[PDB]
Structure formats: structure tokens, C-alpha cells
Amino acid sequence: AIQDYFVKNRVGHSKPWESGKFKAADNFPDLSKHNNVMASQLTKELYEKYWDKVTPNGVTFDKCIQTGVDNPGNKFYGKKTGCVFGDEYSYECYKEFFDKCIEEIHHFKPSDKHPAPDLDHNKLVGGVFEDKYVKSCRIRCGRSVKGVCLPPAMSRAERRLVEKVVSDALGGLKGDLAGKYYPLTTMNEKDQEQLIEDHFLFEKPTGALLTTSGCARDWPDGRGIWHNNEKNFLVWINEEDHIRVISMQKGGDLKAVFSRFARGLLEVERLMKECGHGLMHNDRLGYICTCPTNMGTVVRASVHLRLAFLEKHPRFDEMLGKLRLGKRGTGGESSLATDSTYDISNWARLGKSERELVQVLVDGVNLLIACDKKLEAGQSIDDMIPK
């Protein structure tokens, strides 16, 4: 019984509901100056209904929305999500709040349901861009391990479980896919930094969401990178998410980056299976992760896209919004463009297939590049912007 108490106090914070001198209203967050997806969808009503309810793992509602409280604004590009899931139970315990987020982000309604997997890279039209415009190509997705708490709340022991488990199965791969794990704890600074500068490694734990949600606890115990000799298939271990599987290469041959991601993902998902550990999956929303942007396919495919004329255009960002494309910096989400170059990728992840989402990138990329071209030639693109 004692462990029950311990487990449900996992947070180690005072629970304002239990002893009764406070109403929910007395704890209601102040989101006056806030601009995220949680402060868009959170209603005093929802809070009153959700604050005193705790998942089997000790996760509380405030545990969830803490990063959106602590982060009203953004010094870079985009509007943040302002909330995380702490376990495999958080979406269900607070479904009426998370359904609304999922809608804003993915355009995926409470009545909606995730489609079957399509990883056929061969069904893909386009994907091979001129290297003048496209500097390199990257496809990544994320996965969680089943019955384990996610990063924001997972304890030390669970994280050491994950690293073992995953860095184990990753050694089952073979051929141009074989490779080696490199734990961050023994990695010296210069190597670490050179891997980040080169785009193969996750940043130092300085990101807002990373620190305020609690994915940077105990750093770097449990944090590591696995890659092949070519370093064109890499896996991250225990940063934002237990696993990120990453295909990438310089140039503009997306199609080849997808053909490999598809080849490596299927192995990894199978080997994980082959060791007895499943991956956190929901019937309605597919695959689950720390952030509600990372659901469904969890796929985000991007290019480094130099747009020297179109970026200066007034309706550039609008075009991105309608074309349903994120816009990040050269070095990532917490970075600004360089040399007029933007990381540009599919925004929605829930409610389309891997191939469908990669076709979106492709199709919108062409329009983005085709307009840069029109502009160069002292011309107009007013009609090539979606209505």
C-alpha cells in the first residue's frame, strides 16, 4: 500500500484539491499574456473538472500544462503547444482538453480516427529537388516504449530501462544499417558539439519545453546517440522522446531519404517487437509521444530550403500556413534562419499517412521554389498563393 501512495505522489508537489481550503478557481493559471495551444483551449470549466484527477502513475493535470504556463512567448518561429503528456494515460484522463489541442494542431476531430500506415516511398511523386534550392533532406519520427512513463515524468530507473532495451535491439540491425551507440555521459564536449553543429545530435538541454516539462532531469544519465558508419540512419535516445529514428543526407534527394527511413523504421519497430517490448500505441491517434504535435505517424520531414527572394515577400508566412508547413531555423526549432535558409517541413502528423505527409512537403516545396523563381524574374505570385 505504501508504494501506492509513493507512486501517486510521483510529482512531489502539494495537491491543492485534497485538504479543502482551496477551490480549483483558486489555482486557475493566469494565461492573460499567453500564446500557446494550451492557453488557447484551456477553460476554467475544464480545469475545475480536471485538476483533482490523477493518472495511475501519479501524473497530475498541472504536471501536463506546466510548460505552457511557464512559456507565454517564443523568440523564434511559430506558436508552441504549451502542454505535454506525461504517460500513456494522460490523453485518456484529460481527453476533453487534449481533443481540442489535437484539433487545432492536426485538424483532426474528436470524431476522427487515424488511417493505416503507408511507407511506400515508391508511390511518391517528386522528392528530388534542385540542390541550388535544397541543401539537405531529413525525415524523422518518434516512438515511445509501452508501459513506461514518458520523458517529462519517467524516473531514473525507467530511463535506464529504456536505454538498455533500445540500445540493445539497435544492435540487431545489419548491413548498411549496422552501427554503434554512443552514450552522452562519456562523450567529451568537443565531439558532442561537432555532432550538433553538423546536425546529427540533439542540442544541449537548454530548450524551453525540454527544461520546464522535466525531460532534462538527471542529464545526461540515459541519453545517447546511435548511428551507422555512413551517419545517414541515426537514432536518438532519451531526449524529448525515448526514441527518435532519423534518416538524412545532404542535397535534395528526399525520395532516397524516405526509402531508407522506411527500410530502417520497419526493422527497428520489428526488433523492438523481437525483444518483447511494444511501442505505446493508441487506436484513435496511432503513436503517442511527449508532445501532441508528435502523434499519428509522428513523422516530420523537412528540407533546408534557401529562399532568398520569397522570404522577403509579404505573404510568405501565410503561404506556409495554408500549405500546412512549419518553418524552423537552420540549426533547428530554437534557431533562426541563416543565409536566407529555412528548415521547412510538414506540420500535421495525425490524420494522414507517412507517404501522404511526405507528398505534402514535396508538393508545397515545389510551390515555394517556383515562387522564389517568379520573384527573381521581377514577376508576381499573387495567384500562386492558395486562396
Ligand X SMILES: Nc1ncnc2c1ncn2[C@@H]1O[C@H](COP(=O)(O)OP(=O)(O)O)[C@@H](O)[C@H]1O
Residue 360, marked binder? no
Residue 143, marked binder? no
Candidates 97-105, 300-308, 359-367, 369-377 — which segment interacts with ligand X by CB under 6 A? 300-308
Where helices occur in 185-253 by DSSP H, the ranges are 189-197, 208-213
Closest approach of a copy of itself to the CB of residue 52, in Å:
5
Residue 209 in the binding site for ligand NMG (CB under 6 A): yes
Judged by CB under 6 A, the residue of 121, 159, 223, 328 near ligand X is 328
Fill in the amino acid letter for 67: T
Judged by CB under 8 A, the residue of 35, 40, 74, 211 near a copy of itself is 211
Residue 156 in the binding site for a copy of itself (CB under 8 A): yes
Helix (H, G, I), strand (E, B) or coil at 381: coil
- Reported as type and span, the H/E element at residue 135 is strand 134-143
Judged by CB under 6 A, the residue of 37, 154, 165, 303 near ligand X is 303
Give the number of C-alpha atoms closer than 13 A to the C-alpha of residue 116, restricted to the C-beta side: 2
Residue 93 in the binding site for a copy of itself (CB under 8 A): no
| Nearest residue relative to ligand NMG (C-beta) | 81
Residue 192 in the binding site for a copy of itself (CB under 8 A): no
Residue 140 in the binding site for ligand NMG (CB under 6 A): no
Residue 69 in the binding site for a copy of itself (CB under 8 A): yes
DSSP string for 76-92: SSS-B------STTHHH
Residue among 106, 149, 163 nearest 298 (CA): 106
Residue among 69, 62, 114 nearest 90 (CA): 62
Residue 199, marked binder? yes
Residue 216 in the binding site for a copy of itself (CB under 8 A): yes
Q: Which residues are catalytic?
A: 140, 240, 244, 291, 293, 300, 328, 333
Nearer to ligand X, 99 or 343 (CB): 343
Residue 333 in the binding site for ligand NMG (CB under 6 A): yes
State the cell numbers at 104.
487545432
Residues 199 and 140: beta-carbon distance below 8 Å: no
Residue 162 in the binding site for a copy of itself (CB under 8 A): no
| CA–CA separation, 227 and 382 (whole Å) | 44
Residues 246 and 206: beta-carbon distance below 8 Å: no
Helix (H, G, I), strand (E, B) or coil at 348: coil
DSSP character for 378? T
Residue 291 in the binding site for ligand NMG (CB under 6 A): yes
Candidates 138-146, 154-162, 224-232, 240-248 — which segment interacts with a copy of itself by CB under 8 A? 154-162
Residue 332, marked binder? yes
Residue 244, marked binder? yes
Residue 268 in the binding site for ligand X (CB under 6 A): no
| CA–CA separation, 302 and 371 (whole Å) | 18
Candidates 9-17, 127-135, 192-200, 310-318 — which segment interacts with a copy of itself by CB under 8 A? 9-17
Give the C-alpha distances (Å, rounded to integers) separating 318 from 326, 327, 380: 11, 11, 16
Feature table: binding site for ADP: 136, 138, 140, 244, 300, 302, 328, 330, 333
